[PDB]
Nucleic acid binder design. Sequence first.
DNA 1: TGCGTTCTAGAATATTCGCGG
DNA 2: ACCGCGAATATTCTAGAACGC
Lengths: 92, 102, 101
Amino acid sequence: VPAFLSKLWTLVEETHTNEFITWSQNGQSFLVLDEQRFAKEILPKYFKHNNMASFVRQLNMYGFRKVVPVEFQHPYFKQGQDDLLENIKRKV
Amino acid sequence: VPAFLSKLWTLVEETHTNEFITWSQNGQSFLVLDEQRFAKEILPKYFKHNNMASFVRQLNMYGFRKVVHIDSGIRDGPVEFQHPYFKQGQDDLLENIKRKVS
Amino acid sequence: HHHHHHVPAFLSKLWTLVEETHTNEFITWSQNGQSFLVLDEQRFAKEILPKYFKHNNMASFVRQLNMYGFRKVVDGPVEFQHPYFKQGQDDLLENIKRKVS
DNA sequence: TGCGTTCTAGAATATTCGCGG
DNA sequence: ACCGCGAATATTCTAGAACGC
Ligand code: NA
Ligand code: NA
Ligand code: NA
């Protein structure tokens, strides 16, 4: 599993980040509750940038889609099912 | 068991090196906690060099893989390596680790 | 503060690192201007690299050097050379090419 | 024939920028 | 500003290759 996916799983799963990024209620998507604080305070703790656009570029590269707080989903990104991450293949 | 693996086992297992190189908390991988001091103060006591890169090349020659460190963005952090046959309390598995041949 | 806008960031930053005097404690031209020296690989990687790049790994700095065609000149300084990386000849930087595998 | 050290390269992922809309 | 996406470069991790023993 590439670093982006395992870090993203950790971010969403960990409760100590839940003020800015968390599973949706049913566990099928994740929410960014405060984009600006997420990008300025959380992104540089796990990635080499503080740029929401570079996070979103990676979401696109891994096939995530925005859901109509911002919400993203991937069929193989589900609460309690980290074994499924191996199914997610980055775009070339 | 070639010298690299027995020396690596002793390095990880020994408590007195644990500031530099230690089992991870699950015992399925090992950590190098201070890469610079490990390379300059530990490596040349066990090997003919003081270069982390030459240690790392050997780790990969023996089939070890680097573990992603989750909380690494932006006092250097740990580096973690794992091998299915390098496990705390299971030194009987070391004989199964065969170096790649060039 | 690097400033060679016409070449990739790595070469512009490398030129500034070598040329600027306040970094000469870490990285500087060799005496004849034909190569550059990293004087203390440990201090350079920990104190200088993350001020200019998104990492503090000598190996990733060296990967870039080789990718742009630099060769190591074979404890102490490490020395790297490129025919087109030369003191007083910044017009040659744009002849340095990034290798493609 | 195999192991150790060094230097360089392959390939994948990661970050940024810019384009058209 | 967004949004999807191509492209250039950066960074990481592993491997190739030369050479000594
Ligand atoms: Na969370
Ligand atoms: Na130890
Ligand atoms: Na300098």
